Design a protein around this ligand. Structure first.
Ligand SMILES: CC(=O)Nc1ccccc1O
Length: 284
């Protein structure tokens, strides 16, 4: 029974290596990673791989790994797939811990924009969780943390993390992680998966996929939001992605909004992430 080596980048940046039979479905590898992580609330998470075009794809747990990675290396990342709108309702602290690690990467990467004060507050909770109570011994007037807090670090930000860290004395790691999440969950791009697209007129837009629904980021002055309930049907054809928006009370017919994606694979990927979010956040 021939087995393939799998390498998984974990949310703390470490590498997990295991073997699965070469015809294994994605669920097999995911179960091994989740067991390694002592993770029970697995429904929020998944594995990503980089395709032949170098795009992030979700590993479908129901299909063969080899029919997804195809010509590519069996190299994966462990990631949050469905960001819970209310992390306080997760049953386990260890779930909230992995969600914090993902969000720290979302922030450092610039995928999750954040004001100066929120960067410092989030950073202060991470430090409290990771190091415990503020200690002046490790912190002189010139201190710079090993922790990555932001896409661009400044001495002012490092100072503000320390000032807020001082206020968290006696906070336990679970407590600091919960505070981190109560702040992060409110950010306007929390849990938003962004896709480049063009509207029916050829104007460059971004489509965002999240728990609440679909966002079309057009102008800055113009952001259209379609709650999942308002979305009747999702479809793709060639390079195009279509949503069917319900009739408002007393209107005879649904409206169709069409988008042009860069290529057919980008359209299918957007379609699948929308279907999965629609299903997940219809049940939650
Ligand atoms: C942006 C926001 O706060 N909520 C939201 C997002 C997408 C669709 C409908 C919505 O209500």
């Amino acid at each position: 029974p021939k087995s393939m080596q799998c390498k998984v980048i974990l949310l703390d940046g470490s590498e997990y290596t295991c073997d699965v039979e070469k015809r294994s479905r994605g669920q097999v590898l995911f179960d091994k990673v989740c067991e390694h992580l002592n993770l029970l609330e697995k429904d929020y998470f998944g594995l990503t791989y980089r395709d032949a075009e170098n795009q992030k794809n979700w590993l479908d747990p129901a299909k063969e790994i080899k029919k997804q990675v195809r010509s590519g290396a069996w190299h994966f990342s462990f990631n949050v797939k469905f960001y819970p709108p209310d992390p306080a309702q997760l049953s386990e602290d260890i779930t909230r811990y992995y969600l914090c690690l993902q969000l720290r990467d979302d922030i450092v990467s610039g995928r999750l924009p954040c004001s100066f004060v929120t960067l410092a507050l989030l950073g202060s909770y991470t430090v409290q969780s990771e190091l415990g109570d503020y200690d002046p011994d490790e912190c002189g007037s010139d201190y710079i943390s090993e922790f990555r807090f932001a896409p661009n670090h400044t001495k002012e930000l490092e100072d503000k993390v320390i000032e807020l860290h001082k206020s968290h004395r006696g906070m336990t790691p679970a407590e600091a992680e919960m505070h981190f999440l109560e702040n992060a969950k409110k950010l306007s791009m929390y849990g938003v998966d962004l896709h480049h697209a063009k509207d029916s007129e050829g104007v460059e837009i971004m489509l965002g996929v999240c728990a609440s629904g679909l966002l079309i980021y057009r102008d800055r002055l113009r952001i259209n939001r379609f709650a999942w309930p308002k979305v009747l049907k999702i479809s793709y054809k060639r390079n195009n992605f279509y949503i069917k928006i319900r009739p408002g009370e007393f209107e005879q017919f649904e409206s169709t909004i069409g988008f042009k994606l860069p290529n057919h694979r980008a359209a299918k990927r957007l379609w699948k992430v929308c279907v999965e979010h629609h299903t997940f956040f219809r049940l939650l």
